[PDB]
Design a binder for this molecule. Structure first.
Ligand SMILES: CO/N=C(\C(=O)N[C@@H]1C(=O)N2C(C(=O)O)=C(CSc3nc(=O)c(=O)[nH]n3C)CS[C@H]12)c1csc(N)n1
Ligand SMILES: CO/N=C(\C(=O)N[C@@H]1C(=O)N2C(C(=O)O)=C(CSc3nc(=O)c(=O)[nH]n3C)CS[C@H]12)c1csc(N)n1
Ligand SMILES: CO/N=C(\C(=O)N[C@@H]1C(=O)N2C(C(=O)O)=C(CSc3nc(=O)c(=O)[nH]n3C)CS[C@H]12)c1csc(N)n1
Ligand SMILES: CO/N=C(\C(=O)N[C@@H]1C(=O)N2C(C(=O)O)=C(CSc3nc(=O)c(=O)[nH]n3C)CS[C@H]12)c1csc(N)n1
Lengths: 265, 265, 265, 265
């Protein structure tokens, strides 16, 4: 009867909607296509920064990474302003989470090192979290482009929600690093019209968006009730039936979120 | 399931909760104790103003109403400061709705004329709108003091939603007067922590609160979805079993609001 | 060049304006007719409360004072709701400051005891604060009605500002009682259009209004800058040239207040 | 004496303050560094939109503008979410004014056409309004990064105040387009802590902010007194001597505005 509304949202927006809200002490899990695969798009950038924070002392944030204009591919509002100066790892994190900067994501992946420009190590980091389903295989911007049915660069609402839960509410990171990740997510600039727009203002919402082709629009959020109770909300969506150029529907995610807000109220 | 969620709100907040949202083309009616009686409190001030607008040309709003300190018998944030100046009917309407001014309501009731200082005339106005259930019996401040179980000064969420629906979305008032009422409710200063607090920010909420003893807390709203689709939302609550001094719990109204929002999204 | 703006305001509103802002460490005193006499009106109710708190061991706030309808004189939104209940001193304090309740002020005056229904003791309380200038001679509502030029029931902006300064920023009261007075002033419901309306929202404003005949409109405030710097602002006004029935002008007080805010920024 | 207070602010905030308020019938102009050059930053986005409106029939607002990830080279809260969807000229105007979107500004500059990617046409539009002083030389984001003393991408408080005056209060724009601009400025989301924070809440403030390196913080506003009298407030500031990374002091602009309000009250 919650599922009835999500599928009505799917019909409204001609979209495939994936939602996961992990169970807590007081609420049952919310699952709609919780285990179907959806493309990460930029949502991997949040666990990416967690991986970077994990592998390395806080001090590593100050390392200056220089890069060239040839490295700038995909939306990079911050990295485009810093080719000449370079960027520290730390700000690369900042840009990757708060602005969904793709160049910053690629540099952080390279900083993870290893085959596929870091994707195997980032996949590995998710595994160290118990997420065996998700995988990152390409860099920005290729990871937004895989056709439907392709398992590359996909997660599921279930897996990615649980990952975020460990990163923000659990002990994946020592409190020092958990605060930095949580702060960047909290000051994200890309999610205003998604999960943030679907919850009442007095719910705190930290989130990481993802947007890609085939109408891919994701949002991963930690939301706090007015009473301060946290819930992890994974909302993922695509419109593959509309082809590569199918437009993402931000309103779809805000609606799905309001529905989740209604069950969490 | 929605009824189940309301029942938990009721249990959580030691309160009796009444919710009504009239059906639309796209949504079924939402009813929880839709036909149980709850005390008006200052929620009557909105149809009160409608009555004055209905039986008077607009220019009647400019009429100067003078009154004495002896008329200041209830909380009157605006009327208390204008004993020496007088106040126009227009100003009284504004004060009754936006500040829940009790003297302004009594003076608007007086402007209605008839037995009981306007209370029979205002009830009659509810009758001409098809509300056979509601009744206003006392003035400010007595109408907030009636004991639980007494039908005096009571309405139901069903009835008041239907009244508010005709006033804001229907043709109870010509567009002239409808705009003035809609504006006053829209700039209401008392409802931020009630239905407004439960709906996402991109929803428009115009509302009239009511608060009284026995933990009475009401909010009647017309809300517009981001798509611009209107809904009438009546939420009434009391904690009468907690006696006269029971504190109203606004968060219950915000929670009930969020649940409704989740079903309407 | 500030006197030029106040006298501008006086000319605009056909009014006598009295302004006093005590000097602080960094700012000079602001004085406009700071030492001319203005009628207390209800502004005495705030130091009245400080008097009651000063001479009683706090438990006295719970003492129940009963009164009769013949005792209800002048604007009394709270007292006229508690006749069969009576009202505790605490409630009377709260009513006198936050609602300017005149009946509550008279009962607190009586509770100070002595000739003239407490007015001599209250004057005496002011003397203990170093204000040798002010005097209270009548109860509500007579104290608002003295003709211009009559020294009875008058203070000066200078005098009341320093009095309020000691009550809120100094040590007239022990910290317990100072908290009760300040909180009452902070939640005052009567000053929204006076000093409060002249200062930017991010300046905190606690205040006590006074209004009377001859266009008497006062507001005494303690204001806190966005930096948290306190200032005492006494703004008093009458329009005696317009006779007993002269209307008070709140906008004069907000404008004068804005002028002050410009100097204190 | 106002100048002395502006100098204190300058000392207080280690900042250079530029203030202009054009004369009206009742008030003399307020000038402090009125003819000194300050960097535009995003305040140009307001006349930029007017330039687009001036050159185009309203019908042009619905024209769909498409762009690529390479166009996202500066902070673009709205445009970065619409690379796959594209954006309407109207949306771009809205985004440029209300969210200070850097990409929306560049597309609107491009919409003006001509040398420097629209920069010459925009400067010319300022020239056609009688602004002989101001110049736009770079697009976003370079136009925020000119070193102190460099005249590129600078205006004066005098010039921009007069430009803003003609746009909102004069006849630079026909009434239909003038309302769209005024509406966009009125719903600005970035000016809460500047001129708005320094004027009393009952003053109406529409504004366009600007922020850049060297501690640059501007706010240009049209403000209406409670009586509805309009005033243009140009406040510009930088902390250039503090180097590229100086950060802006919004409270300086709010404090400066409070000073202006006190003289205009
Ligand atoms: C929740 O996000 N809301 C935003 C939004 O998109 N804001 C962004 C955000 O967080 N921003 C930040 C920064 O990253 O710190 C900034 C600073 S960006 C910057 N800092 C420097 O130190 C520097 O040298 N150069 N630059 C360019 C301002 S707003 C933009 C917003 C824009 S308008 C509005 N009403 N809200
Ligand atoms: C005899 O009357 N008794 C009253 C009474 O006058 N109630 C009126 C009523 O319905 N009113 C409304 C409103 O419109 O909701 C209100 C509630 S608004 C409000 N009040 C606050 O103190 C506050 O901090 N925030 N907000 C938002 C004002 S009282 C009036 C009363 C008030 S509390 C209580 N237990 N009884
Ligand atoms: C700060 O002033 N602003 C006001 C205003 O006048 N609010 C008042 C204020 O502080 N109020 C209070 C109370 O006494 O706590 C209340 C409580 S009234 C009340 N409470 C009881 O417990 C009871 O037994 N009886 N009654 C009557 C509600 S608003 C009024 C206002 C009016 S509309 C709006 N948005 N604000
Ligand atoms: C290369 O450009 N450099 C920029 C820049 O993008 N400037 C633009 C400009 O003028 N903008 C404006 C605005 O409209 O004022 C703003 C101010 S918005 C804002 N962000 C916050 O985080 C916040 O807490 N409050 N507010 C109000 C965003 S940057 C853009 C910059 C911003 S801070 C800094 N040191 N440089």
């Amino acid at each position: 009867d919650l599922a009835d509304r999500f599928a009505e949202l799917e019909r409204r927006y001609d979209a495939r909607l994936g939602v996961y809200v992990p169970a807590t002490g007081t609420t049952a899990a919310i699952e709609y296509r919780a285990d179907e695969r959806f493309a990460f798009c930029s949502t991997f950038k949040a666990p990416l920064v967690a991986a970077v924070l994990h592998q390395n002392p806080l001090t590593h944030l100050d390392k200056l990474i220089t890069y060239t204009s040839d490295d700038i591919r995909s939306i990079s509002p911050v990295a485009q302003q810093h080719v000449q100066t370079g960027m520290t790892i730390g700000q690369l994190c900042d840009a990757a989470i708060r602005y969904s900067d793709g160049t910053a994501a690629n540099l952080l992946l390279a900083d993870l090192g290893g085959p596929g420009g870091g994707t195997a190590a980032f996949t590995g980091y998710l595994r160290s979290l118990g997420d065996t389903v998700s995988r990152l295989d390409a860099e920005e911007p290729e990871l937004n482009r895989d056709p439907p049915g392709d398992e590359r660069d996909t997660t599921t609402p279930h897996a990615i929600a649980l990952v975020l839960q460990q990163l923000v509410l659990g002990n994946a990171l020592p409190p020092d690093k958990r605060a930095l990740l949580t702060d960047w997510m909290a000051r994200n600039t890309t999610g205003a019209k998604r999960i943030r727009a679907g919850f009442p203002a007095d719910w705190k919402v930290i989130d990481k968006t993802g947007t890609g082709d085939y109408g891919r629009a994701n949002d991963i959020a930690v939301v706090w009730s007015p009473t301060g109770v946290p819930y992890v909300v994974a909302v993922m969506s695509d419109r593959a039936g509309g082809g590569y150029d199918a437009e993402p529907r931000e309103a779809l995610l805000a609606e799905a979120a309001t529905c989740v807000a209604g069950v969490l109220a």
